Amino acid sequence: LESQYQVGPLLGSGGFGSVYSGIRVSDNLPVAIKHVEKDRISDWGELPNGTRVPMEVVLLKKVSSGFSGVIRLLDWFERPDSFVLILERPEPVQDLFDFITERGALQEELARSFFWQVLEAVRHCHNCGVLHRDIKDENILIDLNRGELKLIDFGSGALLKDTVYTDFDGTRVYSPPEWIRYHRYHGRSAAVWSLGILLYDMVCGDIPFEHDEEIIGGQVFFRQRVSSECQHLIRWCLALRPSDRPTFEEIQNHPWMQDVLLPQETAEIHLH
Template identity: 55%
Template sequence: PATQHQRSPPPPPLLPARRVPPAGKAQQGLKEQYRLGSLLGRGGFGSVFAATRLSDGAPVAIKRVPRKRVRHWGELPDSTSAPLEIVLLAKVSTGFPGVVQLLEWLELPNDVLMVLEHPERCQDLQHFIRARRFLPEEVARELFRQVLEAVRHCTSCGVLHRDIKPENILVDLATGQAKLIDFGCGTYLQDTAYNHYAGEPTQGVPPEWTHFGWYYGRPATIWSLGVLLHQMVCGKHPFRRGQNISWDHQLSLPQGLSQDLIRQCLSMLDSERPSLEELLCHPWMQDIHLP
């Protein structure tokens, strides 16, 4: 069943990032390797299409980002210059099942293309929740645990995702595996404060950014995880769109045991939020039914 965590089959091998200088050859090579399918999504980042790898029939996704929208570049281990999203994906996309795998990338004169793994039967978490109105706590616990492990993996690789939300979590319906996707708002993890926010303003913006114009990566991530868990078990965002979160704001929390975890994550003081390790050790995460 989709709610059980099973071992996923190994993803297609990670290909070395490469450039194909002549645009015509690159586009021709793409057509020879992949059959383009339906549009999966479109936004400020560009477009994502379903595709099939012709060599073995494997389903993939192809993300197209206009070069003019690539604001930050970095260096891959082989000193190749690449958009920061690709550099970050190369750091975390190393066979870890909870993060989408980068299979290949191409740089064209006007676009950057990323070929990503895409399970044959999958649904983003937003649609997964919407189809059920809300998730039972046991289902939410298993998916949330996988998200925590994916975030911990990214953190250990020195990567801050900065846009954790249901739309950026893919659920493999065949295995129940959750995968963190879309590192377009990501950056390098640092111990000092950030003074620039990336991500959807209405989604997981921590109050310290709204009130003071700065945030620290780790506690800001915990805030977004609290918002995510609330959406999973309640079926809705904990705050109204455009709402200015005040220090005396009263949260509408679920009746289940997850409410304590959500309350801790959504503490107004970033210093009072738990760490990732503390979240993973929380009694609710361990399925310990306290009175």
Template identity: 50%
Template sequence: MGGHQWLGRHRRLWLHLARARPQPQPWLLPGPAEDTRVAAAPAAYAAAPPARAPPLGSAAAGPELPPSRSTERTPGAGKAQQGLKERYRVGSLLGRGGFGSVWAATRLSDGAPPAAALGLQVVIKMVPRSRVRHWDELPDGTSAPLEIVLLDKVSTGFPGVIRLLEWLELPNSIVMVQEHPERCQDLHHFIRAWGFRSEEVARELFRQVLEAVRHCTSCGVLHRDIKPENIPVDLVATGQAKLIDFGCGTYLQVTAYTHFAGTQSYSPPEWTKFGWYYGKPATIWSLGILLHQMVCGEHPFRRGQNISWDHQLSLPQRLSQGAQIHLIRWCLSMLDMERSSLEDLISDPWMQNIHQP
């Protein structure tokens, strides 16, 4: 179901949220360093970019981005023959860390008349080449960082995944230009501001995340860092949730992984105990944590807590049996073979009980 179709069925619910919502906050970077084994390259975006921003390269603006060769991977994204200075006006710094830096920007020209993309809000993500650990080839044979190759596979023609508009390679860094959903707030801030959400709201958002994950796996891509910070939601126009930041992603494989990338507090118990995990069950575990955060307002396991194999998950009595037993407990089964499949989650009766206004 498309975003506008979804809005038609849930307009009153989302308009109520939009009127009462707190002021949008910038999307945060991941938590403390001890919470990650391999730090993601987070696409941290501002919820509300400034109306006017200084020209790229000015003293008040962001980094100097000289004209350079560029390769656009998304059809219709523009010719990319001009330098970034001619095509983008950079605004505020949204995040900086070991991964590099992320800047808000406005597209000034798409390089071809008519300039249909004028005024498009984007983010410019700059990653030092030294931080790029894995490279692969795009369909045309171009060598590119794995994050870009994965985005090329999943971000075209599907609204639930952030869209890569273009990328280019500079001598010391990789630059990615991605779409910037307007008037959005990531689920991390959404949960912090509101606490737990009603099962109706959680169900709609969770359904969209499941569809995005299913799309990625159907393309042979494993995200590996599903968490609230990586899921912005348009709270006003469409109610669309998007999956962002494929910096920890890899190819989906049937054999076990022996290297972890992502946020440690979302890693499955088999990784902690044995040092291996399978992609699909590990994804279901992180989805169970996400759903728990949505309906309970907090992570189910305290930071630093060792999860024992006989661990009994405590859930509020107010939750329905569907949310309690068939989903959260199912996703957070200690044995990976006992966890639900993605298709089981999507077809679960609780997920199918979509509110009809």
């Protein structure tokens, strides 16, 4: 209903998709109003009501408990040719891709805080039965006042399963070598690979690989001064064989990850 929301202009000139600024009339809460065409939907799911919805709606609902680290779906609507998703809109924000573009390689203290929060957000997803499958800096929002990161865009995600995945519609330069070579992957170890790409991206200022040959080659060159502890974590996440990669527990127990800043400290030291 355009009676329940005041709809404003397109956000980000379409870079997030068909997302418009909005305000919930009930209480002036800022929202992001995201439109998805039925004709362009890959995977469908069934709601507990038996209603057929896009998988993105199913995954968003499963993670929407109010944990700060993922975008919260507040409501959704079906239209003849589309679904409309009402998402919370934190302000002020910048996405982590733009943030790294203009700040350059991040100090390890800041990368540690950001990476730690991404890890907690992905753990939350997996605990809710959700595999995001498109972790990358473009899909992470920074709340610049609170110092809190938010994972966004579940449009490539899937229900978390323990069996093999044979489909993938995330970002190729973040996808693991077992996907490039065999078009097969398991969810957790593929997520860990994309987190290694993300961590390299943060401390070096851009992702390490652009070509399939680099992804499968097993060589990580560091173009920026990076501590030995951080290099070790990155190389571990980017092990060619999935079983050689760390678990989320091993990542968060790694020496490089200790003594993380709180979100508010992060904002005060690095963002304000």
